[PDB]
Design a protein around this ligand. Structure first.
Ligand SMILES: Nc1ncnc2c1ncn2[C@@H]1O[C@H](COP(=O)(O)OP(=O)(O)NP(=O)(O)O)[C@@H](O)[C@H]1O
Ligand SMILES: Nc1ncnc2c1ncn2[C@@H]1O[C@H](COP(=O)(O)OP(=O)(O)NP(=O)(O)O)[C@@H](O)[C@H]1O
Ligand SMILES: [Zn+2]
Ligand SMILES: [Zn+2]
Ligand SMILES: [Zn+2]
Ligand SMILES: [Zn+2]
Lengths: 798, 798
DNA sequence: CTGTTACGGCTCCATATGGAGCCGTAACAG
DNA sequence: CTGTTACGGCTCCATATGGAGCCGTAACAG
């Protein structure tokens, strides 16, 4: 009844020995980068998944790929592990919310059993859109055909074919020797048409033939190369047909192809995804599509109030009970505004995670260890009780939860807390304390216990800043479920936008404000939202978005060169006596130009070795021993250390080393302020997590010279941060605001909210019922509003 | 604590409602085809696997494919399911027995920790052959390079290039327009060589250039087609190089490629799979390869008797304990003769299943339902106690076993028995009885209880046949572990070959006797085994092997046309008054020739419909409604039924219908005798299981006119058969022997053994210790031998 | 010195024909 | 009538080039 883990060496773990109780609610807590998330996901989930995959069929194991074993001695008493974290994918159009939650099948069963028609017999398999019997013939069950408009094909019909008329990738005729150019020349020769005449003056038949091919006509096409020539017979498919075939054959490429394609609803079924005859069967005056289009809460209400005869109740008791239970679970999780007809692709991370949690609750799996990553993220404070009750119900049926959460309310409901610390990175990785909440609070050495007992807390400000007369106004915001509202955001103050889950705040910000600001100032190409007008553009210089996206897709970028301190370091290295004597330059001491980098590894530092029946394995270079530089570059020294030693130095040690140089001390102090004192100046960007990337971006913004006309947009920066990290982030944001800029943060944590300078609340509910503005102004003014959940919470906090 | 299954409609299940207790030893029993195996595998395992896969990552779900949901209402309380059945795959050479059993890692740990050298430091990752650090450089860790001998390239060097010198597929120059022929012509033009001169007279340099390519040389190659011509520049890779690339890029193709390739051991490491320096570290005077080459039992004995100092025992207590426990589990399963260096590819179904069972025992997963398919198959009677103890130990750590077994000893050890009957196919599919063994025995209606109580039993024969002087002698059998023995097999009597597991009987039969008989009489091309001579070939006409291999890979073959009764049925249909009036022919009434089959479905009867983002779905044809015939053919009738009704008729109903025609009555009675009275004459071969195919083959052999010079070879025909099926098979085999033929059966069940006419025993143990002959003669004579396990068992049986 | 803009260089990720087996049929021998 | 052999017909499974983003560097203005 214990999951004994002995000898854990993954990442930065200091060979800990932890005994986690089984079939209980266990929460693992630690600072950002302390190693708790690593200890959970990379050790326990990986071991369980590897064991179950190996126990399964070999072909399925090869299909799922090869999973490396964890660097752990042995683990005793492990059950199969299911990981529920914030992830999303395009998946397929065949998948919707209803079929993911396994409720559409029960709806089909109910319709086939007790539904009445208004001809083949009614069958449960008929109502499904995945079978040819019930699928709409025109839209083949998708319900929305995909096509590319001719307008998007050529951005400028006046321009000629070679002038840049092919905006789509893979078909441009810019290259003379390109296959597309050869095909275009062959088509022009066959049609006796000249490239000089643009599409505007060309006959429509010629353009149609070019776009949709020759419709099976076979013509002789001659190809040329540097030293090869010949002729072959083939039929041109067309640019649109080839693009459609390429899209159907196969993420980035899919997005690029869909950028030029505008989906439209099927006209035969109007998006019902079913045959016209299949919708004849109706229950209570409503067909299947109408029920699927209803929101979860009102659908549950309609099913509860549904009346039926004795025979109907006898024949459909089980289906009705199961549907009611599943809808109750869906409501209890917190998604009472979703519609069963909504495509699963257009779902946020939190909504998808909650949907998966509800599906796992409804499935009824027993004896499975569950690993969760902050279920409370992206969820309002008022739903914490519902989420905790749902988690307790899920655990009670014979499961255990290894929830990695830092919320204060979660700590008071768990049965076992494991704390990792004391610091982060190399400083942490040890089990400082563990036990129930009382023992953690009594423990003085525990980092979480100090914040829980109240020894350290975020003090509310006593004086709040006021607007200086510069305002930004949004008029006619009608995107998604917004009910044509007008919002005023003051400039020069810390602005926080709150609201009930799914109220439309995230849409209103991302799809409208950031996109319009980028298109108006950054000179980008992004489709804006559905808004009337925006006033206050002239008050801004540029807009910067901070997110947890990776800062680099290549191992040639590290924080030292991203922040910009690398150039200053190289200047000092090249301005030494030895470099001047040898006639070196500041560009020599960098692993991105020929002359200084190691020749064997081409400056990457990692060599590639391939095996006969194994994926390529990366090995450290032997010539340079992974130092990324040759002997000549490493010969020079500066105060006892060479370039490799500086690159392999932590932030605090670098600050201690460069105390005499202010132009670098400033940048290193900026990096240290955001709490990145444990990383080194040579860590590859591909190994940087989301929090590290966000902190690096914040440090970069801090280092810049503020002009007082910069707008920062943040989308829940407190995703994956402890209380101390929250305090540090609040301090950094206040410093940024005091610098002379304005910050807009979509935050749900009460600690950040209570220290804001201007609060905009969107409600009063979620889904179509919300989209309005309830309260505005300072938090003190908002707390006085009776009909506002955020106001009541702020009244309790303050 | 119950796995409640309600409304099961898979295959032939009659909507059963079963409540299986949790965390217990449950055995599901039934006749061959009754539906027990379906009810287990297709319902419970499928539902559990689908639930766990859907609970996992979406990309992994797509990688593993789409699994159709079972036709079941709902299942309550299901844990993840792992299926352990007789399956095998080529896998990869990187996988051996040791790494599958997860013991090689512990051996590496022990060698790195306490092993002593005789240079970089010793590291656990160095000893592995999957990393470049310790892998042999020449053989890249495989230990046996793969190459194709030049002799196998051309079967006849005297013949010219176009005379059939390219025996390998994909490179023949028979087709004038083939790419291979064009490449050969281009090479001949470049080398100024003629095709008339064969390889015997051609210079060796030209042959080497042809085989291994031009070694990067670029030449102009001209290609021609029906109406296309041109030239291109390319470098010839060579036939051998292209074949190697094709093999490396990617089962049937792999086997075909390996047929022309003779694997040889690596000369640098002599198959040690490691660098010469890595084998320097030795423990107790033995390196890693020597330990891996030892058998399991002697390796366990060596580890048990190993002595170490106090510090060594303190530092390697856990590794030694785990290795000893794993080797003890391996011995207890029954595989005490295997070597850890043996490749996993060359393993039988039973050995692989037992290895997987031992690995699952060692892993120690908890809260997982285990489904097993006759673990006792391919195992001697003396190891049943060990296997049962192993299964009980596996269950005791918090698991349940849904073992589908029919062995008598298993019934007396289980905690719950579920019986399906009464018959098979449409006749069965109902839960006749369930409970403990006592209640099953007391139940009169239970099919298994009647055999268990002793009401029905296989009576031992009182008079046994004797050899007639015709004998078959094998001289110098040295294949595999056979110790150059000579065996005498009498002809005209029922011969059964027994022995301890892994004694070499299966090798001695399959790799030598059947292959030589086929090559000498059937005029086949199969490499025989390592034997000196065989005497008695002139006494035989042909040899027939009966196995559970599928009889057809296409839906155009059914038992009606395989047995040959279809031609006789069509003759009577064409010999009616209506057919004569219409001028029809006997070939019209068949779905394999144009004229009678449905035009829309081309006689297959199933139409194909493809979706945009879904795999192609098969749908019954709408024009013919799946009758596979047009209206004109179905118009004719014979005694009130048409051809479709005859095809859709069961065996017993067909026997009742055709009582007046003896030439069809004989064949239908033959089919009914082997117990296939529940199938229909229109079932596709692709849907036929192994037992059905074996019974169809037996019926086909029975139908043939016996000439008294036929040899039948069977390899465990009782794999997946109940006691009644065993009795029927024994009766059929006795009928075959009485017909005038000789049957050789490698059987382990005592019921078949006790009714044999001649018993050949191989022992006295398995592995290298066995391979000899212990006892020979009638079972009564064998039972008197004291030093024979089979004789000891037959003493109690008789 | 310090910030900005523009240009050049570099890297990772993306997009139809032959062979084995079975069925039907003609011819022949018992 | 019936078994055997040989031939023809049919079917399923198998085998290199452009674009987005980051880094280094020259030029210019405060
Ligand atoms: N692609 C879409 N198509 C249609 N409606 C959408 C789409 N995306 C969002 N919506 C609607 O817009 C509402 C608000 O979405 P959004 O603003 O992203 O929510 P949110 O406040 O971030 N919710 P949460 O994740 O709980 O924090 C949703 O409740 C939907 O009703
Ligand atoms: N490919 C192989 N290479 C080397 N040795 C082999 C190979 N196959 C089998 N052997 C050896 O031959 C012995 C007998 O094999 P085999 O005759 O197939 O056993 P079996 O009687 O069928 N055993 P079982 O499966 O337990 O019923 C094995 O124990 C091995 O030692
Ligand atoms: Zn439609
Ligand atoms: Zn190097
Ligand atoms: Zn070697
Ligand atoms: Zn048809």
């Amino acid at each position: 009844d214990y999951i004994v883990v002995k000898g854990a060496r993954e990442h930065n773990l200091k060979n800990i020995d932890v005994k986690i109780p089984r079939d209980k609610f266990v929460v693992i807590t630690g600072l950002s980068g302390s190693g708790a998330s690593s200890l959970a996901f990379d050790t326990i989930y990986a071991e369980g998944q590897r064991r179950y995959v190996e126990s399964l069929s070999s072909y399925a194991r090869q299909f799922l790929g090869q999973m490396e074993k964890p660097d752990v001695d042995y683990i005793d008493g492990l059950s199969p592990a299911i990981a529920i974290d914030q992830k999303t994918t395009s998946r397929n159009p065949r998948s919707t919310v209803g079929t993911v939650t396994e409720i559409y099948d029960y709806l089909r069963l109910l319709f086939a059993r007790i539904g009445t028609p208004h001809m083949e017999e009614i069958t449960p398999r008929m109502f499904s859109f995945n079978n040819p019997y019930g699928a709409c013939p025109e839209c083949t069950g998708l319900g929305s055909l995909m096509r590319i408009d001719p307008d998007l094909v050529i951005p400028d019909k006046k321009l000629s074919l070679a002038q840049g008329a092919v905006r789509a990738s893979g078909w441009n005729i810019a290259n003379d020797e390109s296959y597309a150019r050869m095909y275009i020349d062959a088509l022009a020769k066959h049609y006796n048409f000249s490239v000089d005449t643009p599409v505007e003056e060309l006959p429509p038949h010629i353009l149609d033939i070019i776009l949709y091919g020759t419709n099976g006509e076979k013509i002789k096409i001659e190809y040329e190369r540097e030293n090869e020539k010949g002729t072959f017979m083939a039929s041109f498919p067309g640019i649109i047909n080839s693009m459609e075939r390429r899209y159907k054959e196969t993420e980035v490429m899919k997005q690029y192809y869909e950028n030029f394609m505008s989906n439209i609803p099927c006209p035969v079924c109007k998006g019902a995804r079913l045959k016209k005859e299949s919708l004849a069967v109706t229950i209570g005056g409503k067909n299947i599509y109408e029920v699927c289009c209803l929101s979860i809460g009102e659908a549950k209400e309609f099913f509860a109030n549904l009346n039926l005869t004795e025979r109907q109740q006898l024949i459909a008791r089980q289906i009705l009970k199961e549907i009611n239970a599943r809808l109750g679970f869906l409501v209890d999780v917190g998604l009472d505004y979703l519609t069963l007809a909504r495509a699963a692709g257009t779902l946020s991370g939190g909504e998808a995670q909650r949907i998966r949690l509800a599906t796992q609750i409804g499935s009824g799996l027993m004896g499975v260890i569950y690993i969760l990553d902050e279920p409370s993220i992206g969820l309002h404070q008022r739903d914490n009780d519902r989420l905790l009750r749902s988690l307790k119900k899920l655990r009670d049926l014979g499961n255990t939860l290894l929830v990695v959460e830092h919320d204060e309310d979660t700590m008071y409901a768990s049965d076992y807390i494991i704390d990792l610390g004391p610091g982060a990175g190399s400083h942490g990785g040890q089990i400082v304390a563990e036990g129930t909440v009382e023992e953690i609070k009594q423990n003085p050495n525990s980092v979480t216990g100090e914040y829980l007992s109240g020894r350290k807390k975020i003090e509310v400000p006593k004086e709040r800043r006021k607007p200086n007369g510069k305002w930004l106004e949004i008029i006619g915001a009608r995107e998604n479920n917004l009910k044509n509202i007008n919002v005023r955001i003051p400039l020069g103050v810390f602005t926080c936008i709150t609201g009930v889950s799914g109220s439309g705040k995230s849409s209103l910000i991302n799809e409208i404000l950031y996109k319009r600001l980028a298109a108006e100032l950054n000179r980008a190409s992004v489709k804006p939202g559905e808004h009337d007008l925006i006033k206050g553009i002239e008050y801004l210089d540029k807009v910067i978005d901070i997110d947890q996206s990776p800062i680099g897709r290549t191992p040639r970028s590290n924080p030292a060169t991203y922040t910009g301190v690398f150039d200053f370091i190289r200047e000092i290295f090249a301005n030494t006596t030895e470099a001047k004597t040898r006639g070196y330059k500041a560009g020599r001491f960098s692993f991105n130009v020929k002359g200084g980098r190691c020749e064997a590894c081409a400056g990457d530092g990692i060599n590639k070795i391939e095996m006969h029946f194994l994926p390529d394995i990366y090995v450290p270079c032997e010539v340079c021993k992974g130092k990324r530089y040759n002997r000549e570059t490493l010969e020079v020294r500066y105060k006892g250390k060479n370039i490799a030693e500086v690159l392999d130095m932590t932030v605090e040690e670098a600050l201690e080393f460069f105390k005499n140089i202010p132009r670098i001390h400033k940048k290193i102090e900026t990096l240290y302020d955001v709490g990145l004192g444990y990383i080194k100046l040579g860590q590859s960007s591909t190994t940087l997590s989301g929090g590290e990337a966000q902190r690096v971006k914040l440090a970069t913004e801090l280092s810049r010279k503020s002009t007082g006309k910069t707008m920062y947009i943040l989308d829940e920066p407190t995703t994956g941060l402890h209380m101390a990290d929250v305090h540090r982030l609040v301090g950094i944001l206040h410093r940024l605001v005091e610098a002379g800029n304005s910050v807009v943060v979509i935050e749900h944590n009460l600690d950040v909210i209570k220290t804001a300078d201007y609060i905009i609340d969107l409600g009063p509910e979620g889904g179509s019922g919300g989209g309005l503005v309830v309260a505005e102004g300072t938090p003190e003014e908002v707390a006085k509003v009776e009909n506002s959940y955020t106001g009541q919470f702020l009244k309790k906090v303050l």
